[PDB]
Amino acid sequence: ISHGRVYRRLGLGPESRIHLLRNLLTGLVRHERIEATWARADEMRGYAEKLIDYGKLGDTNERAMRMADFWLTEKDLIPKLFKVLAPRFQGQNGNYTRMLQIPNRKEQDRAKMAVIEYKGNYLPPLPLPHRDSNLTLLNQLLLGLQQDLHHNQ
Amino acid sequence: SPTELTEMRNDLFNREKSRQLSLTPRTEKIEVKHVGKTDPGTVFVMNKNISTPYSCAMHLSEWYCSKSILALVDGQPWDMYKPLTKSCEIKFLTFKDPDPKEVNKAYWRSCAMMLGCVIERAFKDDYVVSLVRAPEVPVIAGAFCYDVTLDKRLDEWMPTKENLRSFTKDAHALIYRDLPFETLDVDARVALEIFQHNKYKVDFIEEKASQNPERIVKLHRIGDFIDVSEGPLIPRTSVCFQYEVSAVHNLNPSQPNLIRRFQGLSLPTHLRAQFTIWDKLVERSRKMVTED
Amino acid sequence: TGRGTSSRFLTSVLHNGLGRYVQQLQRLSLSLSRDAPSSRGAREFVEREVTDFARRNPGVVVYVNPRPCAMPRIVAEYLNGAVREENVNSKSVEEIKSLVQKLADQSGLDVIRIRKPFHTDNPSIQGQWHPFTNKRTALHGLRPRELR
Amino acid sequence: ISRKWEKKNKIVYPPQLPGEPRRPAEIYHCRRQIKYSKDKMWYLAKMIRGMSIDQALAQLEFNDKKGAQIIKEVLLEAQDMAVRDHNVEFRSNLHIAESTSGRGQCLKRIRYHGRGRFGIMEKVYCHYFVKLVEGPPPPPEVPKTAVDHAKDYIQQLRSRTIIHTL
Amino acid sequence: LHSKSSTWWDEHLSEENLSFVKQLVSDENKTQLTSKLNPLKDEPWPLHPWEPGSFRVGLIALKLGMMPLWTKDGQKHAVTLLQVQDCHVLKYTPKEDHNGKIAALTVGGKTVSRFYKPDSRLEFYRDLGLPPKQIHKIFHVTDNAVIKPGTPLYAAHFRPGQYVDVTAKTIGKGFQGVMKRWGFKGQPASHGQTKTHRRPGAISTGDIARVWPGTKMPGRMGNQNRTVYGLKVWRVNTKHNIIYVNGSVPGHKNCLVKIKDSTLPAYKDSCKNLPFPTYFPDGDEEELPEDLFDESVWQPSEPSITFA
Amino acid sequence: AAPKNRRTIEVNRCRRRNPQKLIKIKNNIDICPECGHLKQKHVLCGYCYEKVRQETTKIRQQIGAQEGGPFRAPSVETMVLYTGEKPSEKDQGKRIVERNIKRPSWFT
RNA sequence: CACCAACUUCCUAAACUUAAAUUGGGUUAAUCUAUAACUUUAUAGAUGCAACACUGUUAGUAUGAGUAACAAGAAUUCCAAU
Ligand SMILES: [Mg+2]
Ligand SMILES: [Mg+2]
Ligand SMILES: [Mg+2]
Ligand SMILES: [Mg+2]
Ligand SMILES: [Mg+2]
Ligand SMILES: [Mg+2]
Ligand SMILES: [Mg+2]
Ligand SMILES: [Mg+2]
Ligand SMILES: [Mg+2]
Ligand SMILES: [Mg+2]
Ligand SMILES: [Mg+2]
Ligand SMILES: [Mg+2]
Ligand SMILES: [Mg+2]
Ligand SMILES: [Zn+2]
């Protein structure tokens, strides 16, 4: 009975759900790497990317400026979003934020966690997953097949 | 009778091991330090000529025993079950290492050796099967190839698909049995005695002995089967999960003696392959690949 | 108590009656007190009955060990190794004499529910009944509806 | 109170003859008066049964239950007192032979209710016992094959006797 | 450790192999599909003629959605769009083994990925030489109308006019109350009804001291296989293999269905006029138009309807 | 509704020892290549992740000292430099955070 | 043209002929004392002298049940903090 309802139910209601995401987003737009429960971090991820879309539009656009105010509680971050975050992402058209699952919380609450960040941040690189090198047994065999097929092609 | 050949070789193998162990009296502790990235700085005191690299893994944890295939003793690859000789540095190599060159070769030789064992005992006692050698082929070759000479009476018969399927069942049976490889260093004089009947094996033994300053030779035993080993092999057969004898092709320049190249594929439990990927690699192996 | 207890089949020690009957009771030991009312009845048994019993059964070694004691005790040992002890506290000579005679006659076999009154190693002489008995054969052994 | 699992760690066996099989080691460790339910603790104890100690120290680490950390601590004390004070050559040559949780001494308190009424509350404790035996985990139970199932039926029929007769 | 491990296709593939593997599989699917593109030139089974009492095979289609449609009488008929996608006969059982009086054919559709299927399913499809299909279904087919396994099926199997029947799983609505599931009236909201508004009434009779089996009680609704009968075929789009079926068809949009010739008595012998085994475009007996319409249907681009 | 009879330990032992109520074993545990500590395949390694976060806190603390106020976030790009490193020409006009320690291996 | 069927009756060994308020009779478990016995016994003298049942009293532990119910606004540079 909640089929196609993209949104979650968080906070004390619809408005509260909007105000909790405004705080994670402002922390993200400020620190560029923020932690939260997997559910809430994933809920924001859509909102996080769309700010860059408005930032790309530019300062002059009235709609971008107005939106950047409701979604940035601290008012020292609107200049940053437009003048450093937006220039960085001009080349890209998507994939602004990187989300990964940090182990469960060691709090006695034991909630699922995730770390969300902005790509190209100055902070130390996250321990991302690494796929096996082409030299590994299985990988090397496939490469031999590719060479054979490329010759056949 | 072939059964007699296996017994005498087995007995010779046991005698060579017994003298080596008896040759070493008392226990002399030798210092070996862990040089790997994780768990660095650990130092094991081990028994000379008795302790094995597997024991070093046993102290650290069960993960090293399960996931370690080879060990780098002072920058050289050594079999996990091969006893240590002197103080050195030990580094364990898994399959998923960034530079698995040594691991791949060890697995490569290992699989083709199990292939040789299957062939000799697969034939009927009426016919005559002799093993010449297996050429060292890069893993990129797409399959491991063992050359086997056959009796003239079989020169007109080529195995069918059913015959190829039978070999894999025997190969899988060896894998299921989970027989550890036995690593032995043998002087040429003893090695010739164990394989005097096989002229090609004798010639191969001569080449190995000539290469080294001494007459030391490398002998590996898989249960009953005994054969010379080019390089360090996998500790156990169970390390293999997928196995397949792709096809066998007669060597065209075999006028004096007919030889058939037995080509197969295998993948370890670690690096398992999906069904569709397995088929494509299997098909490639059927193509005959020459030795460069 | 039948379902609550063990059971066995009728049995002997070493096929007692096939050859020569051998007395199963092996030893009786009785401890008595010189000055004790409870053992008074047993003291009479030793005075008169014990000598007669010893001669009557010459395969039963009898040990009498008067000691300062509170309860006279008789311990019976059989040839199969089974032991049995019965309290003789304040029993008259008549009771002991009857009690001892039961011990001599019994064997070491356990006193538990005996499943069957009878035992045979060759129950059948003419051949144990099997389904094919009393069944007539047919010419060429043709099973019903077989054309042949 | 009765602390017998502690004493069993002090049993001394007589020396072996030159050809006797090498006796596997046994270790006896436990923790008492744990603030946890014995019923809740059993699920953690039951899980690890019949496993190695580097295979039971991995499953525990990623469990959310509070007892998982408590058990893990007594599976590391056992893994240390075995190598130092019971002569176990290899840390990775052990397996959890037995593991169970027992009731502890509890405390009685008052849980209040809504009409001047109440009920008796018990603050629950428990103990947790583990034995480690040197040697790889015994191979798992192999299900009976169809042939084995059929054989038992025949064996059952073969035992049949003519009942209630000579 | 020395225990069972969990793995998937991507776990080991490297960066370069990842794209190559996802590309090699795509190449194979095209080649396999092309191999079966010519049924009649691949040792087809004998094509027996039609006689009374024959039953044909049916297709499995994907439910794209709905759209309006008008007839030359001016009335609007809501019609649904069903797309046939890679509909290939898979297996052919014989009469006796099938356990029915009639034989049975399996008709799969909607090719899917190969990386998340059990090894047994992949092996069966490899022997058949076709890419795996999302769903299997069984069609009761007379011996005369049998088609060789692996024969591709297309929307030309049907023609405008024929009444057809569609069956598929209904939309799953989850655990629901007695009111919504069975349309129970319920209890009034006011006048003193205390905590009883949507609850079931009296379960059963008191004396029997039990509840009759099959009683209507709260439970999961939907996600149950259901069939709709007597649905006319308004139009057939050959190019995109789209059949226009009157009214509503069970299931959600993009849900696979089982289209089949109607079993109603009036539609007993409507298969005679249509292709008896099936239509084979590779045969090229006749080149059909892209869009096939029914006589009553008012085609677009025609003059506006005038009720003279 | 109240129980009409006490439930026996045999019936209780049937309900609470059912397979549905037991802990299901985890098959996705592995060994981190770098540190060797245990991790789930679809999750990051806590030991390695803790190193990154600990460095992040130190860097963020240094940033806080420099700014010295709530609303002092600089629009210009941020950058972190360690001892022995000097800003490049391409790095001109970028805020610099100074750290006494040497450049960590993971940091590039 | 009969068989099966209940300690009715017979038979080997025995026994000596019919629900419960009430009524007569013979013994026995435990403990203390007298006098003894001395691994736990005897004849007498005694008595707080025997509990599967009173919504009995006290203590302990189950069942319902690991159930009903209980609690901390977010991020960070972080718990006498922004
Ligand atoms: Mg729903
Ligand atoms: Mg949803
Ligand atoms: Mg009050
Ligand atoms: Mg209670
Ligand atoms: Mg109403
Ligand atoms: Mg109401
Ligand atoms: Mg009578
Ligand atoms: Mg009283
Ligand atoms: Mg009582
Ligand atoms: Mg009472
Ligand atoms: Mg309880
Ligand atoms: Mg309940
Ligand atoms: Mg609740
Ligand atoms: Zn790590």
From Swiss-Prot, chain A:
Q: What superkingdom does the record give? A: Eukaryota
| GO function terms (MF aspect) | protein domain specific binding; structural constituent of ribosome
Q: Which Pfam families match?
A: Ribosomal_L17
Return the GO cellular component terms, semicolon-separated.
mitochondrial inner membrane; mitochondrial large ribosomal subunit; mitochondrion
Compartments, as annotated in UniProt: Mitochondrion
Coiled coil spans: none
Tell me which positions the record assigns to the signal sequence.
none
Q: Which SUPFAM superfamilies match?
A: Prokaryotic ribosomal protein L17
A GO biological-process term:
mitochondrial translation
Q: Which UniProt keywords apply?
A: Mitochondrion, Ribonucleoprotein, Ribosomal protein, Transit peptide
Q: What is its main location?
A: mitochondrion
InterPro entries under this entry? Ribosomal_bL17, Ribosomal_bL17_sf
Q: How does this chain assemble? A: Component of the mitochondrial ribosome large subunit (39S) which comprises a 16S rRNA and about 50 distinct proteins.
Per the record, the similarity remark reads: Belongs to the bacterial ribosomal protein bL17 family.
Q: What NCBIfam families does the record point to?
A: L17 (TIGR00059)
PANTHER family documented for this protein: LARGE RIBOSOMAL SUBUNIT PROTEIN BL17M, RIBOSOMAL PROTEIN L17
Its name, as the record gives it, is: Large ribosomal subunit protein bL17m
Source species, please? Mus musculus
Starting at the broadest rank, the lineage of the source organism is: Eukaryota, Metazoa, Chordata, Craniata, Vertebrata
Q: Which gene encodes it?
A: Mrpl17
Curated annotation (Swiss-Prot), chain B:
SUPFAM superfamilies in the record, alphabetically? TGS-like, ThrRS/AlaRS common domain
**An example Gene Ontology biological process:** mitochondrial translation
List N6-acetyllysine occurrences by residue.
K91
Which part of the chain is the TGS domain?
Answer: 28-94
Query: Its domain of life?
Result: Eukaryota
* Classification via PROSITE patterns: TGS
Main localization category? mitochondrion
Location of the protein in the cell:
Mitochondrion
InterPro entries in alphabetical order:
Beta-grasp_dom_sf, Pro-tRNA_synthetase, TGS, TGS-like, Thr/Ala-tRNA-synth_IIc_edit
- Single GO MF descriptor: nucleotide binding
Task: Identify one Gene Ontology CC term for this UniProt entry.
Answer: mitochondrial large ribosomal subunit
Q: What are the alphabetically sorted keywords of the record?
A: Acetylation, Mitochondrion, Ribonucleoprotein, Ribosomal protein
Cite the record's note on assembly.
Answer: Component of the mitochondrial ribosome large subunit (39S) which comprises a 16S rRNA and about 50 distinct proteins.
**Family (UniProt):** Belongs to the mitochondrion-specific ribosomal protein mL39 family.
Give the protein's recorded name.
Answer: Large ribosomal subunit protein mL39
Q: Which gene encodes it?
A: Mrpl39
From Swiss-Prot, chain D:
Q: Which GO terms describe its cellular component?
A: mitochondrial inner membrane; mitochondrial large ribosomal subunit; mitochondrion
Q: What is its main location?
A: mitochondrion
Mitochondrion recorded as keyword: yes
**Keywords in UniProt for this one?**
Mitochondrion, Ribonucleoprotein, Ribosomal protein, Transit peptide
Per UniProt, subcellular location reads as: Mitochondrion
Q: Does the keyword Protein biosynthesis apply?
A: no
Gene Ontology biological process terms, A to Z: mitochondrial translation
Name residues in a coiled coil: none
Gene Ontology MF term list: structural constituent of ribosome
Q: How does it assemble?
A: Component of the mitochondrial ribosome large subunit (39S) which comprises a 16S rRNA and about 50 distinct proteins.
The family classification in the record reads: Belongs to the universal ribosomal protein uL22 family.
Protein's recorded name: Large ribosomal subunit protein uL22m
Read off the lineage from the record. Answer: Eukaryota, Metazoa, Chordata, Craniata, Vertebrata
Its gene is: Mrpl22
Curated annotation (Swiss-Prot), chain F:
Keywords on record: Metal-binding, Mitochondrion, Ribonucleoprotein, Ribosomal protein, Transit peptide, Zinc
Give the top-rank taxon of the lineage listed in the UniProt record for this protein: Eukaryota
Q: Which residues form a coiled coil?
A: none
**Chain positions recorded as Zn(2+) binding sites:** C32, C35, C45, C48
Task: Give the free-text PTM comment from the record.
Answer: MRPL32 precursor is processed by the m-AAA protease (composed of AFG3L2 and SPG7), which cleaves the N-terminal transit peptide. Cleavage by the m-AAA protease takes place prior to assembly into the large subunit, an essential step for mitochondrial ribosome (mitoribosome) assembly. Proper processing by the m-AAA protease is dependent on the zinc-binding region within the tightly folded C-terminal domain of MRPL32: zinc-dependent folding halts degradation initiated from the N-terminus and triggers the release of mature MRPL32.
Q: Does the keyword Amino-acid biosynthesis apply?
A: no
Q: Where is this chain's protein located in or outside the cell?
A: Mitochondrion
Q: List the disulfide bonds.
A: none
What is an annotated GO biological process for this record, any one? mitochondrial translation
Could you name the Gene Ontology cellular component terms for this entry? cytosol; mitochondrial inner membrane; mitochondrial large ribosomal subunit; mitochondrion
Q: Which GO terms describe its molecular function?
A: metal ion binding; structural constituent of ribosome
| Function field | Component of the mitochondrial large ribosomal subunit (mt-LSU). The mitochondrial ribosome (mitoribosome) is a large ribonucleoprotein complex responsible for the synthesis of proteins inside mitochondria.
- UniProt similarity note: Belongs to the bacterial ribosomal protein bL32 family.
- What is its quaternary makeup? Component of the mitochondrial ribosome large subunit (39S) which comprises a 16S rRNA and about 50 distinct proteins.
Q: What organism does this protein naturally occur in?
A: Mus musculus (Mouse)
